[PDB]
């Protein structure tokens, strides 16, 4: 009775952790690209402001 209950539970819990990791991956990728775009823009605006001030 026990291993039926254990291997069911582990299957379920590992299903959930996999789906939770998958959602976190999606959310971190989004954050990654937002940061990625802002670094490019910020770096460029610095160059422009310097060039312009001359």
């Amino acid at each position: 009775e026990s291993t039926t209950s254990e291997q069911s539970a582990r299957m379920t819990a590992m299903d959930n952790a996999s789906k939770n990791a998958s959602e976190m991956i999606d959310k971190l990728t989004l954050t990654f690209n937002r940061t990625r775009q802002a670094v490019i823009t910020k770096e460029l605006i610095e160059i422009i402001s310097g060039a312009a001030a001359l």
Partner: protein, 85 residues
């Protein structure tokens, strides 16, 4: 015109993201300082002065109204971005 003559209008701005992009185009060609997402400091005022004009008038001014449904396109559900906020 309708709002001011006791009539009711509804306006849809489809879409205000694209308008802001238009304005940033113009502002950067004017060499105005780019800020967040390369938008000019007055991109907020662009939309604020426009949407303030949607109003409900009291009976003393005719009882008319303008209702506005501006549309904003988010990128990947990001409602925290600069133009959306």
């Amino acid at each position: 015109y309708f709002r001011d003559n006791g009539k009711h209008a509804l306006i849809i701005y489809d879409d205000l993201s694209k308008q802001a992009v238009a304005y940033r185009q113009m502002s950067l060609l004017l060499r105005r300082p780019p800020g967040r997402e390369a938008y000019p400091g007055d991109v907020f005022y662009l939309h604020s002065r426009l949407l303030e004009r949607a109003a409900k008038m009291n009976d003393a001014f005719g009882g008319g109204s303008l209702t506005a449904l501006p549309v904003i396109e988010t990128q990947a559900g990001d409602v925290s971005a600069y133009i959306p906020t």
